Amino acid sequence: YTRTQAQHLFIILMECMKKKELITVFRMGSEGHQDIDLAILTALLKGANASAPDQLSLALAWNRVDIARSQIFIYGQQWPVGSLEQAMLDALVLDRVDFVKLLIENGVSMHRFLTISRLEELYNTRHGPSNTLYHLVRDVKKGNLPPDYRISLIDIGLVIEY
Amino acid sequence: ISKHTQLSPTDAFGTIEFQGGGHSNKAMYVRVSFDTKPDLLLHLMTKEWQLELPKLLISVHGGLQNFELQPKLKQVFGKGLIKAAMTTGAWIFTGGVNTGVIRHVGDALKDHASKSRGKICTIGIAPWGIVENQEDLIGRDVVRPYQTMSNPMSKLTVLNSMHSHFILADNGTTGKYGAEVKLRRQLEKHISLQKINTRIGQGVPVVALIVEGGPNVISIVLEYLRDTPPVPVVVCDGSGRASDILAFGHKYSEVTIQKTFTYTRTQAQHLFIILMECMKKKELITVFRMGSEGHQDIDLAILTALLKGANASAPDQLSLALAWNRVDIARSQIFIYGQQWPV
Numbered sequence: 001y002t003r004t005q006a007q008h009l010f011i012i013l014m015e016c017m018k019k020k021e022l023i024t025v026f027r028m029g030s031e032g033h034q035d036i037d038l039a040i041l042t043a044l045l046k047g048a049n050a051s052a053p054d055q056l057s058l059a060l061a062w063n064r065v066d067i068a069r070s071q072i073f074i075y076g077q078q079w080p081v082g083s084l085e086q087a088m089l090d091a092l093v094l095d096r097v098d099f100v101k102l103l104i105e106n107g108v109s110m111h112r113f114l115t116i117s118r119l120e121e122l123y124n125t126r127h128g129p130s131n132t133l134y135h136l137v138r139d140v141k142k143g144n145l146p147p148d149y150r151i152s153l154i155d156i157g158l159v160i161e162y
Numbered sequence: 163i164s165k166h167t168q169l170s171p172t173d174a175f176g177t178i179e180f181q182g183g184g185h186s187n188k189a190m191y192v193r194v195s196f197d198t199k200p201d202l203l204l205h206l207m208t209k210e211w212q213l214e215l216p217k218l219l220i221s222v223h224g225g226l227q228n229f230e231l232q233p234k235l236k237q238v239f240g241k242g243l244i245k246a247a248m249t250t251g252a253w254i255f256t257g258g259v260n261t262g263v264i265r266h267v268g269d270a271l272k273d274h275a276s277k278s279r280g281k282i283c284t285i286g287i288a289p290w291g292i293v294e295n296q297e298d299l300i301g302r303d304v305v306r307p308y309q310t311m312s313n314p315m316s317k318l319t320v321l322n323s324m325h326s327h328f329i330l331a332d333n334g335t336t337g338k339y340g341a342e343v344k345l346r347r348q349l350e351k352h353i354s355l356q357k358i359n360t361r362i363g364q365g366v367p368v369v370a371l372i373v374e375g376g377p378n379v380i381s382i383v384l385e386y387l388r389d390t391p392p393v394p395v396v397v398c399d400g401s402g403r404a405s406d407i408l409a410f411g412h413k414y415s416e417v418t419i420q421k422t423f424t425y426t427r428t429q430a431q432h433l434f435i436i437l438m439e440c441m442k443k444k445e446l447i448t449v450f451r452m453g454s455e456g457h458q459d460i461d462l463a464i465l466t467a468l469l470k471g472a473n474a475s476a477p478d479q480l481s482l483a484l485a486w487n488r489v490d491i492a493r494s495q496i497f498i499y500g501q502q503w504p505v
Contacts, residue, residue: 084311104182107310109181
């Protein structure tokens, strides 16, 4: 395939094979991960060599649930304190039902997670489908609403009462 | 020290509720000393918890290290155990703390409650000194929330959910096991002497299920096999532990140097004498292999162990199968070629 045995790329091939920690080969049915999409996605997780919160946030952004269920949530991942709460909040604002369900099933308690401040910030999020809350909160409070107004829980209570 | 502790009255019982688990489940609990008389505990379970006497007392033993079964094997084991404990009124004794085989039976319970009705009286006997939250359980006769999340560096363990009862045994220590083995064995001995509703004269049968195991598990198996009423023991081949050693020794029973796997104190220390004694009394041990032999179903394997292991007459087996409300067991195992039914 090259200029006889005189010319060879075997040394550089052995260097690449020395760096084989990141290469993820694929064989049709002879090994595990028979699916290309699983093979490509799992390469970015183990190849990142990052902490568990990074992998969870990435899988949350991709809107893939089975990837986080299978690769991330495994035996003794040693989740840092406060990471699961932030993951719950991020999955909550982005309208990811599967991730909320998975986090509830894996140790996160809704009674402890929810608080006044977190709900208050949850009511002013933007990373979701278009909603009709702002028109109601501008029609209930006064005739006019100043721009860039944080919707306090009293305003939402008045909206509910209306 | 030399067990110099205050024999104070109990101050922590009531009801717990697991928050953050897969499902919202409650479980009554009460902490008791290791020297509690088993009759009092049976009375507590009967009149103070509204539970009738069981028709089956499946006990589970295993190693305390959080091993992992190979896939497509824990599924059939869990389904068989669930079927055997659901179709017949059964009590499943277990360690209770979320470690080892207890985690697997908890997963098996969780993988049935989402598909079937009913309840399983999975009484758990766990040492009080190993619970990760020894506090937050002191409110007597009150509902106390409990968080199922645990940290690997906590040096303790969290009580497993889906265990819809609890019994806590304490001997003053903290962070050590071994304070409930005597309590569990005494409770099983007292239960097996109770009288079931049948008037022929048989007591509640007991069957010990062995998964994984350990060096002490061989000793407790020998203890089970040497009781005046012998207790049939069911093991599994696919565990890679003392149960796997028992399965390996089941073939070629009644080759010694093959026993060295660095699992004990070299070749200097060996439990081969005890293992060979247990293999000598292999009439009651009923091993299980996935598809390699007959009785591929765990529920069939457990139920058939109590029939042949009883060594009782045909009327006893028929009455037992009648009490369990299992028909195929009587059809296949009892009504067989020339049973010689008495007049």
